[PDB]
Amino acid sequence: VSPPPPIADEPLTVNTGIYLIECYSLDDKAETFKVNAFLSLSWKDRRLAFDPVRSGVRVKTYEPEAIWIPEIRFVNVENARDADVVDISVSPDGTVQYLERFSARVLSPLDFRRYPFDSQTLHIYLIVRSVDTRNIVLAVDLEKVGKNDDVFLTGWDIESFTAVVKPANFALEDRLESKLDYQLRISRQYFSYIPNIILPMLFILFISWTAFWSTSYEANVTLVVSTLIAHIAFNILVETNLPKTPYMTYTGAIIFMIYLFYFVAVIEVTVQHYLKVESQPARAASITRASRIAFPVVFLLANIILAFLFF
Amino acid sequence: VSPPPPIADEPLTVNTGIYLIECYSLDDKAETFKVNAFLSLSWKDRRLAFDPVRSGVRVKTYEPEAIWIPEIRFVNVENARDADVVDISVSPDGTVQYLERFSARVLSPLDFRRYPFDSQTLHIYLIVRSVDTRNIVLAVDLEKVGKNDDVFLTGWDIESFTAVVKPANFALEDRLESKLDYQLRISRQYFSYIPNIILPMLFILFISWTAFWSTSYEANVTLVVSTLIAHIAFNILVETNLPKTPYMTYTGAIIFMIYLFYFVAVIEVTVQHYLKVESQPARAASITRASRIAFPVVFLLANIILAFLFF
Amino acid sequence: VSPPPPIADEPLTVNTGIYLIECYSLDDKAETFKVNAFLSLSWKDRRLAFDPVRSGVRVKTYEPEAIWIPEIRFVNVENARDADVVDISVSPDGTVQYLERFSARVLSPLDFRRYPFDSQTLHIYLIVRSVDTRNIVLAVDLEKVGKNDDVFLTGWDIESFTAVVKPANFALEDRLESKLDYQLRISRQYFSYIPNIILPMLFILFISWTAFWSTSYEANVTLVVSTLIAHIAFNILVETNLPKTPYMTYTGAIIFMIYLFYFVAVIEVTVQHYLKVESQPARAASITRASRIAFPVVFLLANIILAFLFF
Amino acid sequence: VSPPPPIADEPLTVNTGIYLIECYSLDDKAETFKVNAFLSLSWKDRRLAFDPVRSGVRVKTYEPEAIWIPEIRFVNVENARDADVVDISVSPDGTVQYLERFSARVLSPLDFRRYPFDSQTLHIYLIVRSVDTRNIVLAVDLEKVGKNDDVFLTGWDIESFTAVVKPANFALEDRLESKLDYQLRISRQYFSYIPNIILPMLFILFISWTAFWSTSYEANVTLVVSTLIAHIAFNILVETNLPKTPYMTYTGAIIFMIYLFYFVAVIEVTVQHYLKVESQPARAASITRASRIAFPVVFLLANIILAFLFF
Amino acid sequence: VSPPPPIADEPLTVNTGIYLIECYSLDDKAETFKVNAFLSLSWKDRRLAFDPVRSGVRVKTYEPEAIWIPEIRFVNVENARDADVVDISVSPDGTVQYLERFSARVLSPLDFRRYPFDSQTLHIYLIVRSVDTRNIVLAVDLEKVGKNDDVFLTGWDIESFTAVVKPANFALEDRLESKLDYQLRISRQYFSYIPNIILPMLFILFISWTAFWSTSYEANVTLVVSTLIAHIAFNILVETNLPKTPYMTYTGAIIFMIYLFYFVAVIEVTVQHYLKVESQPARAASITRASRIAFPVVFLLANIILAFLFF
Ligand SMILES: FC(F)O[C@@H](F)C(F)(F)F
Ligand SMILES: FC(F)O[C@@H](F)C(F)(F)F
Ligand SMILES: FC(F)O[C@@H](F)C(F)(F)F
Ligand SMILES: FC(F)O[C@@H](F)C(F)(F)F
Ligand SMILES: FC(F)O[C@@H](F)C(F)(F)F
Known about the structure:
It is classed as membrane protein, transport protein. The entry lists the keywords transmembrane helices, ligand-gated ion channel, membrane protein, transport protein. Five copies of one chain form a homopentamer. Chain A has helices spanning 52-55, 193-208, 217-240, 250-277, 281-310, and strands spanning 12-27, 32-44, 60-61, 72-74, 82-90, 95-107, 119-129, 136-140, 146-147, 156-172, 175-188. By secondary structure, chain A is of the alpha+beta class. In chain A, strands 1, 2, 3, 5, 6, 8 and 9 form a seven-stranded mixed sheet that branches. Chain A has a four-stranded antiparallel sheet with strand order 4-7-11-10, with no helix packed on it.
């Protein structure tokens, strides 16, 4: 067992195909996903040619160890894939048709900029390193790239599973490597973030704003501080489900902006009380009256500015 | 070792049967469960037939490697099942009776719409891909589908373990695939949600409503805000034990609706105080008196509307 | 290698023995425990008998693959046990003495009714399936059932490790199955629950009762609500360390009952203030005075009733 | 391959040695640690003895399967160790020098009594079970017991890695067993507990004591209750990182004692207010004045008593 | 298969090189990281040399088992690396060129002193133990040390992957051990700590300082205590994501220092009220006025002192 030799001096083409069966565990924090799929491989090995007449059988079946099989590996995996050889069929000409079912944890970075309204392009990079006797090249057999209809990935929508037909051939450690890019396009199902995080966060903020219709400092201090604590809780909850990004996320921006609102409202509440004690409730009253409009207006404007910057 | 050949040109029938031994780890968030069961396979291989009289042995036992065994795989699994071959028995007519005990982590989506009063149909999909020499078809031997009496799945009730007799036969990557659907029907034991989540959540809400029998703004602000924080806690606790759904759940709806109640009660408490400071306690008094009835009534009506929509 | 044939037509007795080495990870939520023990198997295989004299050896040693060894499996395990064959000894009469050291994750349900003052009976079910040529039966060699003195199971006391001598024989998928029940009797070390959960929970409740010696509504609302939140925290902490039971637990009952106390105390606090505002502090004063005795009395009575029902 | 036979009727001495390479994951809750070390085994097998002059070679090499190797196992492990045979060298007299590198998860109970100022003695128990032909005995080759300089165990100090030279020889299931005790002495790096848990816990308690310099019941109720909630948080945080002990820990004692302080302070704060409302501020004033001294004094005395009992 | 013998009496040089493919899971608490890379080994084995003319091939391919391959191990790993042999090529002069792709969990301590503004040097220690026939020594083939462009480590910046050319040779259990140090230089992406932890922590502290512009003790007690609770939350959140260090961290210092600020502010708040009740608001007023400047000034100075000490 060693590579099939060239007729002329051409490189060996291994036709590939990935057919998704299962998609699960898209971990945001880890930027990983688990995949269970069929990996199909085809190449001509003339050494394996046979006469169906002389051997009875139209197609021969081989055990992995019996024949030369190309060393196909995934680039962006945690550990080497768990594979089970489903079948190895050889036609009389020596054309090998290899099928395996595999499972792997794929490392694919995510762009959290538009979270939870983001979409992603997951990658599965197939690779072959060239042997000494001959160069091995990868190719996509589009007939063998797909996914089953039941492929669901919890809390995401699957747009497309396609392969970039042209491999990336390059040198690595004094040998040629032929790499293919399989692309899984998905979009996050943002629905649940609305009643679980967005609306509750807004409600608590709006409740803080009731202090603009109160002259009671002690009640205001309670209203603003208490809701700020509930906001910290939401911030912590949100940040625990996301990885630490070197960029500002849409969600991150909003969450942060809201802190400034609580801070300014505390200042207002402090100012209003200070003036009242200092026997000038007229100034205080006009500040409070302005705030009642300013706060919602500035909040609504700021959000428009943000959504614009982010989308 | 290669498939047994057809007498005429009929497909090979593999008689299947799953007998559950253990059911555990139904993870709601992951939408997975662990299973430990017997997998029974039975097909005819004439090449294995023998004389009952001349052999003197009623049945013959083989080692997996000695004979051709169909490649049965599960569709909705995380990784390929962990199997141990228990026994392989061949009768004189060449009927093969294979038995293995396996363990696997099954991927089966759940409908959270009626949580925690929901019922589910877990699936275990058995599959076989046809070979070049012949088409392999799956069949259910109802005599070999079951579960042991002790099979308990913590916090769930096991209604039935049945198999859809008619396999789904279809082409996949230029070969035939025979797929069977094993169904585990279960219903959630909702009992514990009542004293742990439902009642405490109602209690805290009812406690907020005591502010309708108080003229103290500062005490009211404390009553409503404090309980709202306890509600956020329950919401977080509930949402951490559930996956992110693209649909509204019964629980989710209730939890959300309750936020509106806390918000409106804050408005009322603000309104009542505002009118008191503005020297008109008569208007305030009639608003508070109305609220005392409105709040429970609207709450009770809203819940009826919801339960109707959901059940 | 195939089963030893019967002298008459008797079944094959496999003498068993489990000797515990390690006991760890009793997971309450999962209702599992890990075990590391010796498994001893002994049966007669005449085909291996020898003359001690012409051999010049009292005992013969074998490698697993060399001889027929019964397929013993555990019923209530997550995955098939991890075993290492320690030693296989053959006496002149063909008596085989097999020893292996194994590790396994055992599924054994727990009765949470008396938690944290509960005791449990963990099970380890040994099984063997009968073959075509003969019926394989299990037996307990009491000389080979035990545990080492150092076997400790964190936060539990080990009472006894015994085996039910008479195996449960039954047909499962047209073959007789012989099952043995090994029983590990344990009792929970309740000590720590007293200073960590019980007493703190009582302290916070008693602190709520100080509102019966206060006329300040605003301070009372703070006392009762604040402690109720600390109670919710204890409830959450307790419920996270336990599985969801379809029955009421002793702890569960107490925890729940206490909610009613906080609810009623809120009502009292509301009533007392309402009467004070309504210019009738005499009625309020006698209600508060009654509560001061009622609350502790009813609490103490309720607990007596509960402990009775549960123990 | 079978044991080397005795010259006289002496037992087989297997000289052992453990050389630590890595120490990690000391889990307090689990009472486990992970270890990566060299395991060295040496014994005389005369059958292997050769001539140094004629053979030309002064040392002869073997593959595990080629020769008899004693079955050494660890007692206090979760699962059987992961080992890689490094080398097997045989000297002219038949002395075998076996070396393997292994990794294992060790089960070793901890004494939480002095936490976080505790020290521990971790154990690694080596064992050998005697065979039918001969008795196997373990011995410590002190030249082969050690640890590398870089062996660090996060948040612990490594004092010593020594072996108790005299093995524990005893009967187990009608055979002899020889057991060695390897001891890893460590002491907890308590530093971080001071600014993260100790001081914050004291600060919140001292803040509660400011109510002894306040006549405002409503402010006092807030001071004492709020800090008690922060104490419950610290208690929960501390108890989640420790296993459930049947004994009282130093930390446990302090944490609990502090609850009594919050309870008594609540009583004081209630008493002071009650007397004030009852128009006798002189009695109240002298109670508060006494408390100002009593509380710190009793706290300081109680801690001295505790530290004494525990250290 | 045994080591290539020395021409003179020189040690065997094994030329190494690690080429990183994947970098993930830098766990701060565990002080571990996962790595997926190519391991390249090259040594001369003259017993394998050949004439390119007679053989008619300029290279020779071998299966691992066919030839002698040095036992290279990693020092700082949890368990032995998961490796797949990619290729083994022999040149005419008997120069062996080995390549494997491996995955491992590396134990590399981190210096938390400057967190979250820290940089780290991760280590990968390659080792070889010399055999009886000869001494093995490791060397770096700089042409074969690298990383691919896509190598990203979430929340960290990869500065350099270099190897210390000169191995650390030493005696370990009477044999020579040659050790190489591969160094991965990284710097933490501190960005996210600013809007998620730093700023919110400052905001809550600044909000506490509004009590210096209030005469309301009850409102002040609420402001300072409530924010102190939010600070405890941040402290807990921060400490859960870090290991327990025997040294003070920059973050740790700040977090702790801030507690003193809350404590002193409580004292001030208590003093101011005490003076007011004692009918001397003039002294109280000047203390409060001083605090308004003192607090921010001392805070700003203290931070300057700290940043200096730490950077
Ligand atoms: F700010 C919101 F739009 O985004 C967040 F708050 C999140 F994550 F969705 F909860
Ligand atoms: F019924 C709703 F309130 O949902 C809650 F009860 C739940 F989910 F069960 F905890
Ligand atoms: F109810 C009592 F038994 O105590 C419980 F609440 C406990 F111990 F926390 F589980
Ligand atoms: F009480 C002291 F021993 O410290 C404890 F509170 C601790 F370390 F925080 F757990
Ligand atoms: F405050 C600085 F010390 O850094 C802190 F904010 C941190 F690490 F982010 F928690």
